[PDB]
């Protein structure tokens, strides 16, 4: 999370029933959040606020410490959170997707998707796109949507493995898609062509990040705890990081314009 | 500068109607867009002017456009070296075990 009034990065990690914030310059603790009755399941940050979800209700944290807004109305656990301007998108386990206005706490729009046909496993809002969110499924299909018009723009047939990760590439119209088979597909959503494909034989791709300091380097996580560095320019593997963590990789990110 | 340099040397599959229609959106009174103005006349610009402003802010933040944006063992992950059937030379792999006469200790040769 980048901050206003302080030209620094902050990284927020969940700790049981609370969360901790550290500055990336020296990994020093700056704030410890208030407790919530149940264990936090999903977390999101949008610069100004930190969003945490527990059970079927999720709340917003201000000043990284104390809650100021709570949002009820879901009958299943929240599995994805996407901040969208002044609005927040929450996706439930049963298949309900609802957009909430943060400050007024009113219910803007609600959508449902059939669990057997289309179960949401990844959510992404591509940059420079007006009111557009891309949704992936365990089945393997992708749907592009417009929140404001509430219509289906396009449906991507995709691949039969199923989507497990979505990431915005350092380009206007390019995304990186992770699959359960260990294959990462870098795709252009506007004209529907696949730029390149990379395959890791370590299980599903947990997370993907891009290096933006002038070197075309890509990293993809694996549940074994290994990290593979792929060369985007020459379509090859640079090197592999073995046992970066003893357990499964939770999330990996390149800092902006940094090595 | 340019003179000195010389001497030395489809269609999108989908369309969104609200992006087509020419409505105008206020950069003023919106915190995220107030930081994005250029001149004072751009208090409220239309859809097409929003699109090019957003894209160039993205590219300047990214530092430009990457070059990649416009049989073999290093397009997969795997090993290269394996163990040989014959005994390797140089280094012997050994682990000490319990003494053979551990149960019956003796002091003679």
């Amino acid at each position: 999370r980048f901050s206003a009034l302080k030209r620094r990065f902050y990284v927020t990690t969940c700790v049981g029933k609370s969360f901790h914030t550290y500055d990336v310059q020296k990994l020093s603790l700056v704030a410890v959040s208030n407790s919530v009755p149940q264990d936090i399941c999903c977390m999101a940050a949008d610069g100004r606020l930190v969003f945490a979800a527990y059970g079927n209700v999720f709340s917003a944290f201000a000043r990284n410490k104390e809650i100021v807004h709570t949002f009820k109305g879901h009958k299943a656990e929240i599995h994805f959170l996407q901040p969208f301007g002044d609005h927040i998108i929450s996706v439930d386990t049963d298949g309900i997707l609802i957009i909430w206005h943060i400050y007024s706490e009113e219910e803007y729009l609600q959508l449902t998707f059939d669990k057997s046909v289309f179960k949401i496993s990844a959510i992404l809002h591509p940059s420079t796109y007006l009111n557009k969110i891309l949704l992936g499924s365990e089945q393997g299909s992708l749907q592009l949507w417009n929140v404001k018009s509430n219509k289906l723009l396009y449906t991507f047939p995709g691949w039969k493995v199923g989507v497990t990760a979505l990431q915005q590439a350092p380009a206007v119209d390019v995304v990186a898609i992770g699959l359960m088979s260990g294959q990462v597909i870098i795709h252009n959503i506007k004209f529907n062509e696949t730029l390149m494909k990379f395959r890791q034989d370590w299980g599903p791709i947990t997370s993907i990040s891009f290096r933006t300091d002038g070197h075309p380097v890509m990293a993809a996580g694996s549940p074994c705890g290994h990290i593979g560095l792929w060369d985007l320019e020459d379509k090859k593997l640079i090197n592999q990081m073995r046992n970066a963590h003893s357990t499964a990789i939770a999330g990996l990110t390149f800092l902006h314009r940094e090595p | 500068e340019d003179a000195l340099l010389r001497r030395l040397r489809k269609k999108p599959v989908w369309v969104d109607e609200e992006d087509e229609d020419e409505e105008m959106v206020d950069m003023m009174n919106n915190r995220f867009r107030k930081d994005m103005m250029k001149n004072a006349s751009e208090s409220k610009l239309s859809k097409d002017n929003l699109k090019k402003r957003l894209k160039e802010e993205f590219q300047h933040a990214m530092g430009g456009v990457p070059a990649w944006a416009e049989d073999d063992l290093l397009q997969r992950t795997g090993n290269f070296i394996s163990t040989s059937t014959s005994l390797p030379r140089g280094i012997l792999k050994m682990k000490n075990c319990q003494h053979a006469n551990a149960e019956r200790p003796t002091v003679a040769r």
Partner: peptide, 7 residues
């Protein structure tokens, strides 16, 4: 984002 605040 450009969604309206309420309704």
């Amino acid at each position: 984002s450009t969604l309206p605040t309420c309704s």
